[PDB]
């Protein structure tokens, strides 16, 4: 079933990556960072991969009008009627599923994908991709005529059924955080926040371990300790822009959508 098609996606979550240019020529950390663009089809139907997943809500459920994205340590939702893809003009979105957007764009030089936030902000990521199509045949037309010939060509179907091509799945690593520390007189207080926290302090002796509560360590400065979130029960995509956890072994496989058809 359509809802049953995302049985695997119940075990994956989005992530935040490093976007070199996110609107105003300032490298930033973005939840919609692009990874790769594939243009195998001769029709000219670009397939774009980016961190944010489309088709699932924060409650881990099917919904075609919501996009779930990582924000801080949590998962937030955005409306699906606020997704824009542009090369030099406004493109046209043909299909979406999970990690992938299948669209078509006019000739240009740079590709930009933008979404809206909960606070009505705009989060966009833009990369360079020299794209121009030449249609199959011996004529460089632009718009389909109303009388002509039929030539075989290759395109991408909208079917979401299982396909041979796969993508890898890995354990997300511990994310350092500095907003979980407070200074009180001459001690450091760290708060659980509802997640397992691994802590390493240098002051004193035997002040290293893992905790699930709010603790106070006496005679220690705030810069003297490091805490990191370590729960990470979900799975994350193996991206070169994020560090790899201690285990160097593969953890999962996820089927890719939109195969190539004649």
């Amino acid at each position: 079933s359509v809802s049953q098609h995302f049985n695997v996606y119940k075990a994956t979550r989005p992530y935040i990556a490093y976007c070199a240019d996110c609107g105003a020529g300032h490298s930033c950390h973005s939840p919609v960072a692009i990874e790769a663009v594939r243009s195998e089809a001769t029709d000219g139907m670009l397939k774009i991969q980016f961190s944010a997943q489309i088709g699932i809500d924060k409650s881990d459920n099917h919904d075609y009008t919501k996009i779930r994205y990582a924000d801080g340590h949590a998962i937030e939702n955005a409306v699906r009627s606020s997704l824009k893809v542009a090369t030099s003009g406004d493109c046209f979105v043909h299909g979406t599923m999970g990690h992938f957007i299948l669209a078509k764009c006019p000739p240009g030089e740079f590709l930009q994908v933008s979404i809206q936030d909960t606070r009505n902000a705009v989060r966009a990521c833009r990369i360079q991709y020299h794209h121009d199509p030449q249609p199959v045949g011996r004529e460089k037309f632009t718009i389909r005529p109303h009388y002509g010939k039929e030539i075989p060509c290759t395109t991408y179907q909208q079917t979401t059924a299982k396909t041979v091509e796969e993508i890898d799945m890995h354990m997300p690593p511990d994310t350092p955080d500095r907003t979980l520390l407070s200074q009180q007189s001459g001690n450091v207080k760290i708060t659980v926040g509802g997640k397992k926290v691994k802590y390493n302090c240098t002051c004193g002796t035997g002040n290293v371990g893992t905790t699930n509560s709010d603790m106070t360590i006496n005679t220690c400065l705030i810069e003297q300790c490091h805490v990191s979130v370590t729960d990470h029960k979900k799975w994350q995509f193996n991206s070169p822009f994020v560090p790899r956890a201690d285990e160097p072994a593969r953890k999962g496989k996820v089927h890719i959508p939109f195969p190539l058809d004649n």
């Binding site: 994310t175 955080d177 500095r178 240098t202 070169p240 560090p243 790899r244």
Partner: protein, 49 residues
């Protein structure tokens, strides 16, 4: 046409790493010392250098 597969880098804090050779086409591996990675939250490890 081909593709390049590059997995996520391994970052080791307060230690050393050494990668062994495998039987893969044009496999290239390297180890770099003296790195101070950064993330959205903060520094990744105590060890400076």
């Amino acid at each position: 046409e081909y593709k390049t597969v590059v997995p996520s880098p391994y970052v080791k804090c307060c230690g050393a790493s050494e990668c062994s050779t495998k039987e893969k086409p044009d496999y290239q591996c390297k180890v770099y010392t003296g790195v101070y990675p950064f993330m959205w939250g903060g520094a990744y490890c105590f060890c400076d250098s």
